[PDB]
Amino acid sequence: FGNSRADMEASGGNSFNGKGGANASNTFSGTLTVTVDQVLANGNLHVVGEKQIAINQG
Amino acid sequence: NYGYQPLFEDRRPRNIGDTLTIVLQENVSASKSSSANASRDGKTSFGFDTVPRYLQGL
């Protein structure tokens, strides 16, 4: 060890960060009167309805 | 006039010449709104700033 033959110095680093996300929301707060389309074998009713409103410009 | 006239009824108009009182009290209000948005942002980076002797080729 007379010289710096044994003198040693070293550093090392490794950092990793990963992220991920997702969202999906929906809301509906109306009331619509529909009409029966047909009666199924079990008695369930197929209902279809439509409502058109022309407030102004569309 | 020789026509018959009830005593206890509310004297509603009944013939062509009869007059009636109308209170307008009309009030209509309609509103409509709609909105939409879509934002996408991406930004990628990669850099050595120091390359090993064995990796200098790539």
Ligand SMILES: CCCCCCCCCCCCCCCC(=O)O[C@H](CCCCCCCCCCC)CC(=O)N[C@H]1[C@@H](OP(=O)(O)O)O[C@H](CO[C@@H]2O[C@H](CO)[C@@H](OP(=O)(O)O)[C@H](OC(=O)C[C@@H](CCCCCCCCCCC)OC(=O)CCCCCCCCCCCCC)[C@H]2NC(=O)C[C@@H](CCCCCCCCCCC)OC(=O)CCCCCCCCCCC)[C@@H](O)[C@@H]1OC(=O)C[C@H](O)CCCCCCCCCCC
């Ligand atoms: C979904 C997955 C599907 C599979 C995909 C398959 C891989 C899909 C393909 C991914 C790889 C990209 C191809 C890049 C080269 C290429 O073809 O497309 C180029 C255009 C880009 C199109 C790409 C769009 C893809 C579209 C996207 C498609 C994605 C799907 C054209 C071109 O060629 N341009 C070219 C041109 O530029 P110019 O035009 O200006 O002239 O010339 C200049 C100067 O040339 C240099 O000069 C130097 C001296 O000056 C000299 O060094 P010297 O020693 O001599 O001194 C040096 O030689 C040297 O490297 C010396 C030596 C280095 C050894 C060190 C150890 C490294 C080990 C590293 C190990 C790698 C570990 C994976 O070599 C090599 O052995 C390279 C290692 C081979 C590994 C084989 C994999 C085994 C499987 C090992 C598997 C491991 C299992 C765990 C000279 N280098 C060259 O010639 C170039 C080439 C020589 C080829 C001969 C070697 C045998 C190839 C043999 C076969 C290769 C076939 C592919 O090497 C390469 O990189 C090749 C990389 C291949 C990696 C594929 C992995 C497959 C996984 C397999 C998966 C299935 C170049 O800079 C420039 O290239 C460059 O810049 C490139 C840059 O560097 C490197 C950046 C990489 C970042 C990632 C990409 C990021 C891009 C992302 C954005 C799109």
Ligand SMILES: O=C(O)[C@H]1C[C@@H](O)[C@@H](O)[C@@H]([C@H](O)CO)O1
């Ligand atoms: O005993 C040796 O082998 C040495 C001692 C140091 O001086 C070392 O650095 C080397 C030098 O290179 C000679 O010129 O010689």
